[PDB]
From a paper:
Among the >600 human ubiquitin ligases, UBR4 plays a particularly important PQC role, being an essential and conserved E3/E4 ligase found across eukaryotes. Aside from teaming up with various ubiquitin ligases, UBR4 activity is linked to two specific cofactors: calcium-binding protein calmodulin (CALM1) and KCMF1 (13, 16, 17, 20, 21). Our data show that the evolutionarily conserved UBR4 complex forms a megadalton E4 arena, in which inward-facing ZZ-DZB domains of KCMF1 act not as E3 ligases but as substrate receptors. The architecture of the E4 megacomplex is conserved across eukaryotes, but species-specific adaptations allow UBR4 to perform its precisely tuned quality-control function in diverse cellular environments.
CALM1 and KCMF1 bind at this C-terminal interface, as predicted for the trimeric sub-complex. The C-terminal helix of KCMF1 inserts like a pin into a hole in the UBR4 Armadillo repeat and is covered by a small lid insertion within this region, which also mediates CALM1 binding. CALM1, known to mediate calcium regulation of target proteins, engages UBR4 in a canonical manner, with a long hydrophobic CALM1-interacting helix (CIH) of UBR4 docking into the cleft between its two lobes. Although the C-lobe of CALM1 adopts a calcium-bound conformation, treatment with the calcium-chelator EGTA did not affect the CALM1 occupancy, suggesting that the cofactor is stably bound rather than acting as a reversible regulator. Still, its precise function in the UBR4 complex needs to be discovered.
Numbering used by the authors:
A (entry chain B): 3463 to 3578, 3590 to 3604, 3609 to 3647, 3699 to 3775, 3788 to 4080, 4087 to 4110, 4116 to 4301
B (entry chain D), D (entry chain C): 289 to 296, 301 to 331
C (entry chain A): 3463 to 3578, 3590 to 3604, 3609 to 3647, 3699 to 3775, 3788 to 4039
The structure:
């Protein structure tokens, strides 16, 4: 993860530098090869199953099940903090003009602020504070008389374990109390992992013994940490079954709680302890190696015949201990994940060049991204990979077709066995998200993406399973709704006009020219451009001119029909997928999306008449799907808000239809009341809706004047039958009774 | 905020794009009506 | 779930009575048809996804997202408990030799233990205790002198809201302090949902108004409860993604915690309130119907020409309110689950007859069990379904071949695309468990099962992915190890010699 | 415990079964070794 700035610069330089195509091919091959190798490492990792299962259940930071601890991952950037000297104080001693303090451990001090001077330090651990040759001077600061706050700023941070403060120029030897003034100390420090320096042979022997003890302790802790893996996999196996159990933080599955406790509770602690011991071992090894090298160099320089071998600047860094603690472990999950993130970022930067994009897609990047990086990593990287996959197909028909084929194949294969396993239908969210993202970005390959979406929709529109409706049909309906209702225009000349006035062609009144059956089979004669060529452009008078237009249109249409592709006639069938979608009880969003779809389908009166005819045909579904029709009614009552549509519907004979439906379900209510005593909290919804609809039809004067002589009998019969109800009565039935009585009194005034 | 790679339209093309959006919407409306036609 | 004893007896009787093959065919067809219909109901149920996904994450008792409350699931068998009288006491009055107590609600008392008399009760709710014709006697008791504890037993439990205790034969009228003795009261009771009786027309109007108020409150609570479903869908969809989140009870995924809070915290409370209100409505309706029936019969009896209509014993129970509250809701998830459990138990009992076993496997039961009931229900039901699937193939080579074909096909299809999706290799535990269970039982078709196991082993032994090794190769290796090293012999002559 | 449906071998057949188990074990050993033969 340290290489963010490097890949940033590399991508920027590769993008800004103009270069030949051979170098572009070499660069693309390098990037893709690294990505492929990291994906292969990830999918075959021994701990891949455990981490992949745990990622979706618990919240964990690191990967604490690694045999070889990784220096890059256990050495983060710890920042400096302000610490009281008293909080780390352990032992103290005082004399006439000196004070000696021991800390609990070694600290990297950077600045010392004293609020109301010579400072010495050393890094040698002693047990007795009482125990001029074992101190190192750090900074000499003079004070103005009467000063209260002093800031000893150390140019180079010091690693110290014991400190000493001596008042060179201007204290109780038993208790340390001073009456002239009282001093408090601040430190700008942080913990550090370091050891006592080695100066002679016995110190080296002690260092060797200490390193052996540390290695023993590390081995013990490592075995303890590795002993947790069988229990983790047993709990993973027990979680994967997902068998329901009977008994709000305690209501979660007990196995999930045990998994969280096992991983984030014990494995984490063992990992932290192992990391500390590994750091101590590394520090001790560095100190011993430096001492050994210094001793060897001192021994060699004593001889005169051998000349000192000069080293260049880079060779010195390579040889010295400076280049020793910056390398990641080979079998590291976290580092491989980080490299994959960097590969995705670099590839996203590279893909903005069209030639590099073509070379990348020719390497086979789309399938590698589809198979491996769609579902692995954090949410941010997943959305990033979806963005890159959408970008790689920006204006390439072949790449778009390939991605569509992958998505369609996966969805179809999952949908084949969805009946026997719902997990298949529940694991298409990333494919459908990819399709949504690709469609939402307008380009020149929109037709192929729309074809894929519509094919998936028509394939899975008739499946009644709630998982398919929630996971496939809903997404396709949202895509269709976004395409049908485009965003409002923002240009100044079109800031007011609606989207209906922006089209450059005018569809024929009684004909449909688009043909979905041939379009879905990729027929070039039924393409989008061919369809647009078939329609008359929107034009930017005496009776003779109107007549001339009439006969020209009529006989040109007759001539075209005599010549004949044949356009479809606008005769909507009464059984389709629309009725299934409009009343589905699986989810309300699907119903709302379908309602918006059909509301937008009715703009020109020729289509509005057929849409209203179909919706009227759907009237008998109110009783079966009582509250689920709440959306559909809200559409229907919106589409007949004008009077002439109500009059047209009355002229087609819907008033007897509504009356018969009301009478039939009132008879059903009476029959149910006579027999049983069960309670229904949606009783009277269909009655209330239908009676309100009849009232809306009646309120206008012409239909009221005409259709009173046929409706009084049904109204009074319904009123009396509802009045007979005595036990199966709710508020809605009361409101229906009131409104029916109001209609009865309004009808009989003539 | 210092990353270089994180920092990677006129009115005529705006009206062109709006008109194209309207045409695509109309085409999708017709194509969806074509699937409801009585067989 | 009330029909455990019925199906127990039905399976036993079908197993013990020797019958012709046509009757056996009819019985098998009936059982399988019921199972198929219940499976079809369960898979297409509107709340199927929510419950199915919630089962593996949170622990919950019932299904609280149901539009029509089910009386069968809403009224479990609550037991009698010992309650002290002072715990439920609300208002009390003491007089010279009587004591009147009002409870918090209506209670079903069974026996009363008094520690150191005439007992009256009524079920009319009044607000003032001060507020002989409106009392009902329960039991008259005589005490031997010097008795200290008396356990009055009521042969029929009484549903009462107010109680009265009288001292017919041997207290302060202001405070009730008694100098002779101290009395303490205990009740063998349980809460009850019942309403005041109806005796006239004004009480009928009061009952009608109360029912309307209860219905309004129930509608409000029902809408509140149904308003939770979109939030549950949003959280479910967020959970299904399973994207890692960076931060030990609080270390669990925050979305799972939110799901547990939304379901087991609020949906449960709304469901409980709705159930209480529905029970109150039902009790009030029953009282109103009983009063109306009595009034109608009294009106009809006054006329002389009309003869009283005689009813047989079954007709009286059908007409009266006796058979009114024992029917489950139509679209109930819990009841459909219970019926599927009963079907599995009955079929397991039936399959122990070889002729019935052949008929059942000819109906097509193995595929229905494979597609639907292998992964649905509690753990015990899943193990029982595996046992039944193993039993149906006990000595039928064709049935064993069919089951092996199903298992092999599913494993191969999952393993084809395992590279791109680990859940494919992680959703084979039930197929491999089925194979293990079938092999572990010794029969005459061991060769076909061993062939299936060895074919699956050799097909997936060279795959380095850990999920395949843990989920496919390990199970086949365990099967092979069990077959290679059989259990130590138990016969007396072979107690020492090795395999 | 009152459920009826819940409550639903000699020595010669036991020796026969033990011998058959040993025979099947030997067959499985031979089958497994047959897949380790060099091609
Ligand atoms: Zn690492
Ligand atoms: Zn139920």
């Amino acid at each position: 993860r340290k290489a963010a700035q490097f890949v940033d610069l590399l991508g920027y330089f590769s993008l800004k530098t103009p270069q030949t195509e051979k170098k572009l091919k070499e660069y693309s091959q390098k990037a893709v090869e690294i990505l492929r190798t990291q994906n292969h490492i990830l999918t075959n990792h021994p701990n891949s199953n455990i981490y992949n299962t745990l990622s979706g259940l618990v919240e964990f930071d690191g990967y604490y099940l690694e045999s070889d601890p990784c220096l890059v991952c256990n050495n983060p950037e710890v920042p400096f903090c302000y610490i009281k000297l008293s909080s780390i104080k352990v032992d103290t001693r005082y004399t006439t003009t000196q004070q000696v303090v021991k800390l609990i451990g070694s600290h990297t001090i950077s600045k010392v602020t004293v609020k109301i001077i010579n400072l010495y330090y050393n890094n040698r651990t002693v047990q007795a504070i009482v125990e001029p040759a074992r101190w190192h001077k750090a900074k000499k600061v003079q004070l103005t008389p009467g000063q209260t706050e002093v800031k000893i700023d150390l140019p180079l941070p010091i690693v110290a374990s014991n400190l000493m403060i001596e008042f060179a120029d201007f204290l109780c030897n038993a208790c340390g109390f001073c009456k002239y003034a009282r001093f408090d100390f601040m430190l700008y420090a942080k913990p550090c992992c370091a050891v006592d320096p080695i100066e002679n042979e016995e110190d080296r022997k002690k260092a060797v013994s200490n390193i052996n003890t540390l290695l023993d302790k590390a081995d013990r802790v490592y075995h303890q940490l590795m002993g947790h893996r069988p229990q983790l996999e047993n709990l993973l196996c027990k979680v994967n079954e997902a068998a329901p159990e009977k008994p709000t933080s305690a209501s979660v599955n007990r196995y999930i709680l045990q998994l969280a406790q096992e991983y984030c509770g014990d494995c984490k602690n063992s990992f932290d302890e192992l990391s500390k011991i590994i750091q101590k071992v590394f520090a001790s090894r560095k100190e011993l190696l430096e001492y050994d090298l210094q001793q060897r160099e001192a021994a060699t320089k004593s001889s005169r015949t051998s000349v000192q071998p000069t080293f260049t600047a880079s060779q010195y860094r390579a040889l010295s201990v400076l280049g020793c603690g910056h390398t990641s472990s080979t079998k590291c999950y976290g580092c491989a994940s980080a490299v994959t993130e960097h590969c995705i970022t670099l590839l996203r930067a590279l893909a903005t060049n069209p030639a590099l994009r073509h070379i990348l897609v020719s390497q086979g990047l789309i399938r590698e991204l589809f198979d491996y990086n769609l579902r692995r990593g954090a949410a941010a990287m997943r959305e990033e990979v979806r963005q890159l996959m959408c970008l790689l197909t920006r204006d390439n028909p072949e790449a778009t077709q390939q991605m569509n084929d992958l998505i369609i194949g996966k969805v179809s294969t999952a949908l084949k066995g969805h009946w026997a396993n719902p997990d298949l239908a529940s694991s298409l969210q990333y494919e459908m998200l990819l399709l949504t993202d690709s469609i939402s970005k307008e380009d020149s390959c929109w037709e192929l993406r729309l074809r894929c979406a519509l094919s998936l929709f028509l394939m899975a529109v008739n499946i009644k399973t709630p998982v398919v409706v929630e996971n496939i049909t809903l997404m396709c309906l949202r895509i269709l709704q976004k395409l049908i209702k485009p965003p409002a225009p923002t240009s100044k000349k079109n800031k007011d006009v609606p989207v209906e006035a922006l089209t450059t062609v005018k569809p024929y009144c009684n004909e449909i020219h688009a043909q979905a059956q041939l379009w879905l089979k990729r027929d070039p004669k039924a393409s989008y451009d061919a369809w647009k060529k078939c329609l008359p452009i929107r034009g930017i008078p005496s009776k003779s001119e109107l007549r001339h237009l009439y006969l020209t249109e009529k006989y040109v249409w007759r001539w075209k029909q005599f010549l004949s592709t044949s356009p479809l006639d606008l005769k909507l069938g009464h059984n389709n997928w629309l009725r299934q979608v409009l009343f589905t009880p699986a989810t309300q969003a699907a119903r709302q999306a379908a309602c918006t779809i059909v509301e937008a389908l009715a703009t020109i009166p020729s289509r509005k008449q057929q849409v209203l005819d179909l919706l009227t045909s759907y009237l008998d579904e109110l009783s079966i799907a009582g509250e689920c029709a709440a959306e559909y009614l809200a559409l229907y009552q919106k589409l007949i808000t004008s009077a002439h549509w109500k009059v047209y519907l009355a002229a087609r004979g819907v008033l007897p239809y509504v009356g018969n439906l009301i009478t039939k379900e009132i008879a059903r209510l009476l029959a149910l009341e006579e027999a049983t005593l069960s309670t229904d909290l949606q009783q009277g919804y269909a009655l209330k809706s239908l009676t309100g609809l009849l009232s809306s039809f009646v309120e206008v004067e012409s239909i009221k004047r005409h259709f009173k002589s046929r409706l009084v009998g049904t109204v009074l019969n319904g009123y009396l039958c509802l009045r007979k109800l005595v036990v199966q009565r709710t508020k809605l039935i009361d409101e229906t009774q009131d409104m029916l009585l109001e209609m009865l009194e309004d009808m009989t005034t003539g | 905020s210092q990353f270089l790679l994180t920092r990677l339209m006129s009115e005529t093309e705006r009206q062109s794009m709006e008109s194209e959006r309207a045409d695509r919407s109309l085409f999708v409306q017709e194509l969806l009506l074509s699937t409801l036609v009585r067989e």
